[PDB]
Design a protein around this nucleic acid. Structure first.
Ligand SMILES: Nc1ncnc2c1ncn2[C@@H]1O[C@H](COP(=O)(O)OP(=O)(O)O)[C@@H](O)[C@H]1O
Ligand SMILES: [Mg+2]
Ligand SMILES: [Mg+2]
Ligand SMILES: [Mg+2]
Ligand SMILES: [Mg+2]
Lengths: 228, 319, 187, 319, 319, 319, 228
DNA sequence: TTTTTATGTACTCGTAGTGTCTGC
DNA sequence: GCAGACACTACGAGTACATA
């Protein structure tokens, strides 16, 4: 079972969410942060043919990078993960499934309260502006009938009132008003086009970024407001 | 009725209570925990007790189970300040998808080397106090800095009142019978279970561990009762010899109690106290304590015991 | 310099910060430090004068306090009393007992030991390192070599052991910069 | 006229004063804070007190609310050198169009590891004193470097005069009555609130926390008074046994402190030190140290502690 | 039916037992270990004994071997906290594909400087306890913090019963005979073997080391018996010197009898009891016994015995 | 026969014996060292010699030479635990190129404050016992912890007999004659060297040091008129300091002899006995023995010795 | 002497093996570790015209780094050494030869019991894999007719049973089965193609990596089994 | 006025060194 | 593209603590 460049980049991105991943047989990988602030799934091309839990995903991907892209990954007779190369064989340890904080089932996202779309260029420039203006918070809200992501710097502006960035996403035809706050430290999405679904019910809330391959559910901040 | 964890073979880990009702807690503590689960929102708590096994981690997890909290169990020694600045703050600032309350159980958070993280926490527990509470399990409350103890409900485990210690013991005896029945352990005598609870109290974990240890063949009997409570001998010949001031007899009997020096000397002091004027009881208390102080130092215990016997006989009074 | 003849006369800190010259900002911020307050000598002296004091917010070291008080025999019966049994007592209780017990006196001076040298301690340390012998045997070797007259030859042999980080072992004060030249050429 | 944060649920965070008039500060401190707010500009202040919960963070936020300052709240442990060079300089250098005074509240900034970070701040104030003002709340004042104390106005909390102590205890009792009438808690006995204030003074946060802890059933009756005023865990029983030379009481209590030997010994010495003659002070410290040194050598730790009790009761002469 | 490791040439290391049956343990200790190996799952254990050579490391390795556990043997002094976070966590969080339990033998884990590391384990052993037990072998149990002692089955070596000491000595004699048969050592008489076993008991290793040392040529000669037995003989010369009150003779006879104070003082008490006036006998026990109770902390036992002789000459009367 | 390094400038480092035969030893000691060097591999050994200069370091290096072992000489004070984890473990775990057994000679491992390295060595010496043995040389073996004594075959340098004393005397004469021939020194009278080596017997290190100090003139005339404290084996400097009643010099001098308290206190008692009146002899016995009793509980040996010096200065009448 | 870039890099590598090194007259330099677990030698192009012992080779190379490469190094009139390059003339002490530990004799490696080759890329892969997998011991052994380096983590595997890396070096074509365990701390070689010569006899043995620049002789671990 | 133990361990912070990715 | 920018790591200074 080879891991292509795209699957390896996807798993490298997943390693920034959870340090280790319990990846099961099939073409589906999902991960959840240890504190449960950001969940992610992906339907990937390379078929996985054995259940294994990796306690250190970043190290596993580094070891994979050490050998060529033609390396054949399998389950060794010992039980570990045997990466076979032209002349080298590497036995990455398999973790106990209970020591890797992973979802038991893919969480079924509810019907979205507000649906919009953020393009790859817009997401890239939002991240770059975040690096530049030092904003660590965003708020997806409604302004003059359009859904806007407002980038605030929470460190100097605790009340989230001084808007440092403002990106218009698309038209909002609904009649509800909301302000879904998302920590930018929770936006661990790989660059791409994301359909942004947002769901809220009382104190419950989430924001799903549906990508072409990977979907990222992100937990809203505690001081989010809405009327859904 | 009991909570059994299938994945655990350790007896004290297998039967870990999951609800507050299942915990063997004092009368007042259980009410202040059921009140917390009734309100539905855990305040900052600090469950602390010098004696391990009292139920701090068990109650910390059972609270988050009872209110259905978004528990993030964290090893205390792995809760360094870069962890508080990172995963813990990301946890506390965010709001759970299901709307459950967030609780950080910083278990065993009394290491001195973490005092630079606790100092970081004393504002963390105020900026994110409307969202995420903290339950700190500790063994010595002096390891939790005073500003942190001010922000939390400090609950001391393992110090029950006398009328409540006996209810703890009755509950623990009942729970040990249930554990024995679940584990296929036949109990022939309940006195051994009662004595096993008495010896290790309040260390309920060591109580279950010693229940496992004293049940190698899965049978608790009179032999186990003699083992748990020792009681190898009785004190009449030594007392009678001290009455007669028989130096040779005391010298001969000294090597007899050279094995269980602590038990013998304690029983001897207890027997002696009940048969002497109060004026001298002080004197032979001092003598016996002085003799016991150096027992781990003296090379010839027999000679140590002879010294103790003659000191007793010289400063002696039968009242 | 300063092409503009009006200016506003910014101080060192304003020039350093407004220019974002973090080297100059670090230099200007280093101008405070103030390593001082001699916490220890106001405990021992207090013990020598029975003056009221509190160390709850302070830092107490039993070894240094006992060694300092041992220089004065009048207080030493107390020190010895804490030398056997004070190991288990808290720092607060140790100070409290030394307060209650040590009699008052106008006692001051310098610690009784070898009065440094930085010319003899280095020789002893170097001989101990080269010959793999203890400090006492190193003193014996140096005393023998001084009398025998072979010491300069030995120093010429093992002057290479003196290095950048070795001198820090000898002393903590900033004088080792001279020591590098002291044995620069023993010849 | 009370301030309620409906978002919060911890009682000691829900009712946090939003203004200086609402606080329970001493007469002098409240007067100087009122003068600062009336003047319109906050100077560099350092609100410090070793006792947590005196009101430092409350007073800082209340000042920045009273003068309508552009408060920027910082966790002090996050105010590292990059924070001073980064967000802090960005905040001070930005333009205040609204005329609101820029105030940087560096809460709990007494960490020693941030020594260098403080030097820069001391340099920072020399370059941005006109732009922004700095309020530093701290517990251990020795953790703030001396130059910062020299530049800032240091205000010590939690050491009120006797008249101030009486007045603030009265104010805190009144505020607790308001809190109880606002939380739907019926006050049966009015002395319970006074006991709560007196026991936890000057820690007001602990006062509100104990009020929430003891108001589990919503009624504060004489049972709550007994619980608050009677401190379980103290050595009053042991102390009265020692003064009475109660052999039986000491013998019975010796196994009660068997497990927690070191802490009990420390507390016992600390308590007795203030209630005996100086010569008795020397003697008691000698016995305590000698016994504690042989803690790991003596066999029977319970009999060891009984020996300790006997010696302490014997060789002591109360003042 | 013996275990031989051909790599080693140390006799106490070449013949280390590899199974619990081959170990020489008391009846109850061996029954506990056989029960543990029969259950198939090793719990947390602490094998502790102040006297080295009793078989702690042997029992830990044998428990890992009998259960067929995945064993990780780590020097305790190397098991710092960054080791528990690193290799230990990586080991405990590895898959058990073949069902083998993971046992982390932390040998000699009683160093004081590792207390912090131990304070990290007290939650480690609760998060990886489903399949990863910890066996801690230590010399003094006081070096293992109480929360660890609660989590582990604490088993004390080197303290057998009277009826079990003789059985263990007999088993040692048989094992030493087998070792001599294997090594090519031709024993002259087994009495010297019995003397070796009794002399170094319960230190079973110092026994095999002495077996090697007293077997230089390839045979244990009869003079070895007189060498190991020692015990000197009657001390009548010391008693006469005390009666003669000759200090120089007392200190000439002190060094030879100082080697074995723990008997020399017993012999002196048994002998000179009748050689002095009965009234002064108490003084002897007021002296000699007191002199003994300080033996373990006396630096120069030669000087201690000379001091004893000095007091005996000074404060005794001769009939 | 003699062995000369031809490089070292100190005679007691240049004419160090290279073989067990060349070492001047008692007949029994030389035989028990030949029984080890003739057996092939060396086990762990502890060379104990209370009297300085008997040659434990020389004997250890000779043992390593005779077996043809890859010695790694390490001073005890340079064997910190970070050294044992580093170069020592790297040394022991690897096999030597030419099949030579590796031996680590840890010199004066008892005279050090680093008892935390012995705790590491406890299991270091079992991990690599098939490849690397350890020879630990100790002044008083109470410094070497009990587990290391169980690991290591303890060889104590016995006191020479009369015949052995005479043989040592003649061997010392021959060795000094050859050293003086090789060093370009002409002997005036053979009685001079005979008296020298009789005066400094058995401390041959002191004899060689005195000869090397004298060697500046190139001729031996006085010999007995020695100064500069005559090495550390002599204790005359303490007697001179005590005679002058110089308390400050005693205080400054106590740290010099506090490293080896056990030998110093005995030598002090022996030397003071011959120099004082009998009444103050009996007083010094009580004082010195009282100070020796509490050495084990003494937190700091320097302060203990300083107090002993003070008591001796202030309570003795010189003669 | 003139120390080119290559010789300076070689000396920097040798400085890891031993703190100092006696540079003897000629084109050959050598050093050994203090404990004697490894030895190194080289035939450098530069010619040394005088014997000199450096107690701090790291400090000497640090001094030489900032000064131009063509600097002339000679011995001073007073026994020290001097490095002169146009504008600079820096004096460096020359320690006593008996102070620093050097083999005092070039060890003649016996005829190898088994000769193989390890490529520069293979050695570099072994080193990076050892870093990534926390491998601390390797074992050169015979597996199915080939000579393979098996990397084990000795900390978690005291008996070296769980293989974590396996690199085939080439066909064996012999008749003796061996298992030469080399600590990875003893492998101080710089990257390059190496001829690996494993010699063993009884309880003695060594492994010599012969490179194009330097030859490193390392000592096998204690429990190295063979039948030579 | 009045010098500053030694060893081992753990944590935090600041900075310099090194390695890798990359955007007008 | 490759200098420049970002991320990871090791080391030193400082602090705190236990123990003898
Ligand atoms: N038994 C001996 N035989 C010969 N020389 C000895 C002997 N003991 C000591 N020496 C001399 O002492 C020097 C070193 O003594 P050492 O072995 O360090 O004794 P210690 O370690 O007991 O002080 C050697 O150079 C040697 O000349
Ligand atoms: Mg717990
Ligand atoms: Mg605050
Ligand atoms: Mg062991
Ligand atoms: Mg020596």
């Amino acid at each position: 079972m080879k891991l292509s460049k795209d699957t390896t980049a996807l798993l490298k991105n997943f390693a920034t969410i959870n340090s280790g991943i319990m990846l099961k047989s099939g073409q589906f990988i999902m991960t959840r942060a240890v504190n449960g602030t950001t969940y992610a799934e992906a339907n990937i091309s390379d078929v996985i043919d054995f259940d294994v839990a990796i306690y250190d995903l970043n190290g596993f991907l580094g070891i994979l990078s050490l050998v060529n892209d033609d390396a054949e990954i399998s389950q060794s007779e010992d039980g570990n993960i045997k990466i076979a190369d032209a002349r080298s064989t590497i036995f990455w340890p398999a973790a106990d499934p209970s020591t890797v904080v992973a979802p038991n089932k893919p969480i079924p996202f509810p019907v979205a309260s507000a649906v919009t779309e953020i393009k790859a260029e817009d997401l890239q420039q939002l991240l770059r502006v975040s690096r530049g203006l030092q904003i660590d918070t965003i708020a997806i809200t409604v302004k003059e009938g359009k859904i806007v992501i407002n980038g605030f710097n929470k460190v100097e502006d605790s009340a989230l009132t001084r808007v440092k960035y403002s990106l218009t996403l698309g038209d909002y035809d609904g009649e509800n008003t909301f302000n879904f706050i998302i920590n930018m430290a929770n936006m661990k999405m790989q660059p791409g086009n994301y359909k942004l679904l947002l769901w809220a019910k009382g104190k419950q809330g989430a924001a799903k970024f549906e990508g072409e391959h990977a979907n990222y559910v992100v937990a809203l901040e505690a001081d989010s407001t809405h009327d859904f | 009725m009991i909570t059994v964890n299938e994945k655990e073979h350790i007896l004290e880990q297998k039967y870990r209570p999951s609800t507050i009702d299942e915990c063997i807690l004092p009368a007042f503590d259980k009410e202040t925990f059921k009140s917390i689960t009734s309100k539905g929102k855990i305040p900052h708590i600090i469950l602390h007790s010098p004696s391990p096994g009292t139920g701090k981690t068990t109650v910390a997890k059972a609270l988050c189970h009872d209110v259905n909290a978004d528990m993030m169990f964290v090893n205390g020694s792995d809760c360094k300040i870069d962890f508080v600045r990172g995963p813990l703050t990301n946890f506390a600032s965010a709001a759970s998808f299901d709307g459950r309350q967030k609780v950080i159980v910083i278990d065993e958070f009394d290491r001195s080397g973490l005092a630079e993280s606790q100092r970081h926490l004393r504002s963390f527990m105020e900026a994110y106090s409307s969202n995420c509470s903290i339950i700190i399990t500790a063994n010595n409350i002096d390891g939790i800095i005073k500003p942190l103890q001010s922000r939390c409900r400090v609950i001391t485990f393992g110090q029950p009142t006398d009328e409540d210690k006996i209810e703890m013991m009755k509950q623990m005896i009942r729970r040990l019978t249930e554990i024995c029945k679940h584990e296929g352990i036949a109990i022939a005598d309940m006195k051994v279970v009662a004595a096993l609870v008495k010896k290790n109290f309040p260390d309920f974990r060591k109580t279950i561990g010693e229940l496992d240890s004293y049940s190698s063949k899965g049978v608790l009997d009179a032999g186990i009762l003699s083992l748990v409570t020792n009681d190898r001998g009785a004190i009449d010949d030594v007392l009678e010899s001290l009455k007669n001031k028989d130096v040779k007899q005391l010298r001969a009997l000294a090597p007899k109690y050279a094995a269980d020096y602590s038990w013998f000397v304690g029983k001897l002091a207890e027997e002696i106290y009940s048969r002497v004027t109060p004026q001298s009881i002080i004197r032979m208390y001092e003598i016996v304590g002085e003799n016991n102080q150096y027992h781990g130092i003296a090379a010839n215990t027999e000679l140590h015991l002879a010294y103790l016997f003659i000191q007793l006989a010289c400063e002696m009074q039968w009242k | 310099m300063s092409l503009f003849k009006d200016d506003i006369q910014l101080n060192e800190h304003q020039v350093a910060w407004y220019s974002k010259d973090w080297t100059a900002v670090q230099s200007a911020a280093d101008s405070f430090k103030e390593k001082a307050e001699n916490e220890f000598f106001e405990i021992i002296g207090a013990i020598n004068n029975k003056t009221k004091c509190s160390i709850a917010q302070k830092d107490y070291s039993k070894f240094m306090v006992e060694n300092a008080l041992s220089q004065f025999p009048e207080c030493m019966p107390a020190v010895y009393a804490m030398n056997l049994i004070g190991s288990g007592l808290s720092d607060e209780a140790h100070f409290n007992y030394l307060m209650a017990a040590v009699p008052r006196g106008k006692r001051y001076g310098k610690w009784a030991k070898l009065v440094e040298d930085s010319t003899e301690v280095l020789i002893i340390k170097l001989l101990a390192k080269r010959y793999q012998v203890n400090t006492n045997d190193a003193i014996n070797y140096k005393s023998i070599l001084t009398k025998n007259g072979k010491l300069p030859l030995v120093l010429k042999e093992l002057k290479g052991l003196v290095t950048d980080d070795f001198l820090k072992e000898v002393t903590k004060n900033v004088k080792e910069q001279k020591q590098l030249k002291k044995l620069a050429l023993e010849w």
